[PDB]
Design a protein around this ligand. Structure first.
Ligand SMILES: Nc1ncnc2c1ncn2[C@@H]1O[C@H](COP(=O)(O)OP(=O)(O)NP(=O)(O)O)[C@@H](O)[C@H]1O
Ligand SMILES: Nc1ncnc2c1ncn2[C@@H]1O[C@H](COP(=O)(O)OP(=O)(O)NP(=O)(O)O)[C@@H](O)[C@H]1O
Ligand code: NA
Ligand code: NA
Lengths: 548, 548
């Protein structure tokens, strides 16, 4: 109130002055119920909005009990608070907080500590073209803003019946995800789930859709602390095929699985679907770069006498890029691989005697996944789920086979084996040490690039003057995690030299207190270590080597 | 000079006034050597730059002779003039003209008429935050700009030896493209061409690359009016396969062909490669919409008892989207189809007895391209070029087979036939009337969307409140043609009602004087009729019907 009145009076003087004058507002202001922080002042009304932060001690909120709930329960609480703040702030468009659509992410928009709750958001400072409108600014910052900050962080001001439900569904999702390993499962699709979305350009669920039901033969029942027992499709470890004719729901099922690496909000249709957190969907990429990667397990020969054990390029082929992606995922410690025959290189998937008859000179044939996929399971315990409907030689090595028909799952593993007996149709899979990363070389990119670090949506990531294409990483949900990826790189750049295990280093940097070493931005979400590597594997300046 | 002095004096008065004051500059100004047009004044220094236009009669340029050259020769001249103007204007970044990288397009940045040469460009009006800097504005508009407008449109001021060469290569490209049909060819790759680019994110040519050479067995020699006789690879009509092991240059060859639908600048490496102008590369799309399209020739059965002759959706499958794309291309009159096995649905390409054994209930099997591709050639005279390296059942119906090895073409058609004899393995392809378009329904989108028409790069096109995803259309070169696509739609919206042949209508709208009915913008390039349809086929609000 006193510091607030100090700001009010200080803000009145800025009336009709140049927009540059807002720089004087920069600083901390200890209000009555909270501390207000104004970190970055935009230099233009039409530029990115000014960043603000607000802190509230647990004593004044009536939500101290949240500290004694599970980390997942608190994850939802933080998400619910951000959405509540956004809802109360609809009538004031100058205020904006970073939301994550249908998912619940570990975001910086709302953070918990031992001291209290922290809110991070933006405030588009007004003006009459360029001259400052103090009276409007006062109304936003000293009248409206304080109300949204309070209402969003006061037990009674929030809808508790909706809060508990929100936190409970997220807690259940984490609980269900933790017991996948114990039950020898890599994914779980609860009965009653709504898999299809309204359209291809929208992540919301389709209304009036055929609800999912699992075939008893492949049915499992998990237990959530709030909802209790939940029955659904249990996809066991190993190789699992998703077959069926065209337009029957194979991709829709796989899409739900690939996205179940994240938690979803209630009513989304997928909030009771969980999948191995490290599951990586691989597809064919055109034009990507690959750094000193060993592809001996898949590619045997290359033109221009290049080393298959130290493959490097700035314009990768289809089968080459997918093979590289595959190896990169193993390197990063992925337990599950997702593949869709409709978005992959046929050459890389299957073998063919036809082609090998006329291309049998000095070009040794590539080793297709079908020959290695079995070894990935038996040797590395890596599961794989594949949408097919085209080839059939995979049916032999598959553990389970699911058929989609009129948008319902059917267990056809038994009949699948019968087809092989009626009509029937090798080298050791080598594990390699991870490539070392030149952590200090990243600093050079920042210096030459003015320490620029930002994301343009989900597809691109700018690190200095370098732009990284992340289009292929379709599992990514928000640009917030892309920004976070860039700020992880920024931290890697602070280290002395080379690191012989980057994935491990990245994992340790994001060790629960992942946000403390990043700038205090409100548009950041914890990214997966495997995704940081994936993005880094596609950065054209990245320096990797082989301690071999 | 008099009208210029009028502007100068009129511009001085605007010193230190609000940026809004620039609106008074709007209008025409008859300078000494040209007429200056200031069409749209930006409302913010940080918003899209103000649009300008300049006109110069042929008498004052010394380039009247260009009017007696071929349309293609003039196409290059217009391109060369735009690049010259950009070069002279490097020291003045406030000025900008729309260039098209490595291609030569029919653009609005530089237009010819019977009266004279017209230049269209932007001018970022300066200010000290918001207050107008007249002195700077004067320097840009009355001192620098007039010099670039003159120098770029005066025979002696330009580099003639470079001008002629530029216009000659383009003229040769058109000449070579026109004699493809006569020699029963769909594409021509001249010997000495450089196909690979520096990288996947750059369209410039790779230096120190293995130059292309055609195998005599499949060699042809065309004739250009300037360069004379040129020998290279002649890809005849019908089905042509591009095989070989991984990382040998199959996509690079196909990529050069798909992009040869446009003319390229000298030294680009592809300026002597031509391909059927209507060639459409089809691939698998996820989530696209499809409007009342007949897929009877490919899809036989669908769930939920849907009509295969009137297929409609807002979230299309892989094989479904590719099949739809295929049919849509035939509808639009495409003579050549480009396919890459690494970016396509395997299910859609090949047949398989394996899968049909366990998915043989009420789901009739989809008819794969391999069964129809032959009919497309024999019945519709539609050629197809396919990069394979995976499947081998296509070798049977193929006319010619090219093998890439160490980045050189080899004719393996003879050996390809031998492989089939040693190991060997139907319904009529129906032609349909084109879908009618509800031209007037487009007007409704404009009214509800504030007549908004713009493109965000090459990937997106905004028409009112509707956003169209054009990512799959990888053949597109510039956002200028995407803008042009939107302005064609704008014209379709002016018509009374339904049109039973939209492709024909679009073709007639772009009849050489394509730019006269579009706003006088400088960032527009003539798009292909097939591309306008392609974009329109993916607009979720488009209304198509079947007069059947
Ligand atoms: N349970 C369901 N209820 C209603 N509609 C559904 C359901 N599942 C899928 N759909 C819709 O039906 C269509 C099926 O498409 P998709 O799931 O891509 O089939 P698909 O041919 O198996 N894909 P692919 O993996 O590329 O072969 C989509 O438009 C979905 O939105
Ligand atoms: N003539 C050439 N000289 C030098 N380098 C080349 C040449 N042609 C291609 N390359 C390069 O070699 C690599 C070959 O990649 P690509 O052309 O995709 O092979 P591919 O495996 O046939 N592609 P796909 O069609 O997906 O199977 C690319 O990085 C090219 O840049
Ligand atoms: Na499909
Ligand atoms: Na390849």
């Amino acid at each position: 109130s006193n510091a607030m009145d100090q700001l009010i009076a200080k803000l009145k003087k800025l009336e009709k002055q140049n927009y540059r004058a807002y720089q004087q507002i920069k600083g901390q202001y200890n209000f009555t119920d909270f501390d207000l922080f104004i970190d970055h002042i935009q230099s233009d009304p039409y530029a990115s909005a000014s960043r603000f932060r607000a802190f509230r001690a647990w004593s004044l909120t009536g939500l101290s009990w949240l500290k004694e709930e599970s980390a997942a329960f608190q994850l939802g609480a933080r998400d619910f608070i951000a959405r509540s703040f956004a809802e109360f702030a609809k009538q004031e468009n100058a205020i904006a907080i970073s939301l994550h659509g249908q998912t619940v992410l570990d975001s910086t928009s709302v953070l918990f500590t031992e001291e209290g709750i922290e809110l991070r958001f933006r405030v588009n400072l007004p003006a009459e073209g360029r001259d400052i409108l103090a009276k409007k600014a006062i109304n936003i910052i000293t009248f409206h803003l304080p109300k949204f900050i309070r209402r969003s962080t006061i037990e009674r001001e929030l809808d508790k019946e909706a809060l508990l439900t929100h936190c409970q569904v997220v807690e259940d999702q984490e609980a269900l995800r933790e017991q996948l390993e114990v039950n020898g499962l890599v994914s779980f699709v609860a009965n009653g789930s709504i898999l299809p979305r309204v359209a291809g350009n929208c992540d919301l669920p389709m209304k009036d859709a055929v609800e999912f039901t699992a075939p008893e033969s492949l049915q499992v029942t998990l237990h959530a602390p709030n909802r209790g027992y939940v029955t659904g499709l249990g996809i066991p470890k190993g190789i699992t095929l998703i077959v069926g004719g065209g337009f029957h729901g194979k991709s829709t099922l796989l899409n739900a699985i690939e996205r179940s690496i994240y938690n979803h909000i209630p009513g989304d249709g997928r909030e009771y679907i969980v999948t191995d957190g490290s599951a990586m969907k691989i597809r064919a990429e055109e034009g990507r770069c690959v750094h000193h990667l060993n592809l001996s397990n898949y590619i045997n020969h290359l033109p221009m006498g290049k080393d298959t054990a130290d493959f490097t390029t700035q314009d990768a082929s289809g089968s080459t890029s997918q093979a590289a992606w595959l190896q990169e995922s193993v390197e990063a410690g992925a337990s599950t691989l997702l593949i869709d025959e409709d978005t992959s290189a046929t050459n890389f998937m299957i073998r063919d005697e036809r082609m090998q008859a006329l291309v049998a000179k000095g070009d040794e044939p590539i080793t297709p996944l079908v020959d290695r996929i079995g070894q990935l399971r038996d040797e590395l315990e890596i599961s794989t789920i594949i949408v097919m409907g085209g080839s059939g030689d995979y049916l032999d090595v598959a553990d389970n086979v699911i058929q989609m028909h009129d948008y319902q799952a059917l267990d056809v593993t038994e009949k699948a084996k019968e087809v092989i007996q009626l009509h029937p149709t090798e080298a050791p899979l080598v594990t390699f040490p991870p490539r070392a990363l030149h952590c200090s070389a990243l600093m050079n990119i920042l210096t030459d690039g003015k320490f620029r670090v930002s994301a343009k949506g989900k597809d691109s990531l700018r690190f200095g003057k370098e732009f990284t294409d992340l289009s292929a990483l379709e599992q990514l949900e928000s640009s917030d995690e892309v920004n976070a990826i860039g700020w992880v790189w920024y931290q890697l750049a602070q280290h002395a030299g080379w690191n012989s295990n980057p994935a491990k280093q990245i994992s340790e940097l994001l060790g629960d207190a992942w946000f403390q070493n990043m700038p205090q931005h409100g548009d950041l979400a914890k990214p997966r270590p495997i995704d940081v590597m994936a993005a880094l594997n596609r950065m054209r300046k990245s320096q990797f080597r082989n301690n071999h």
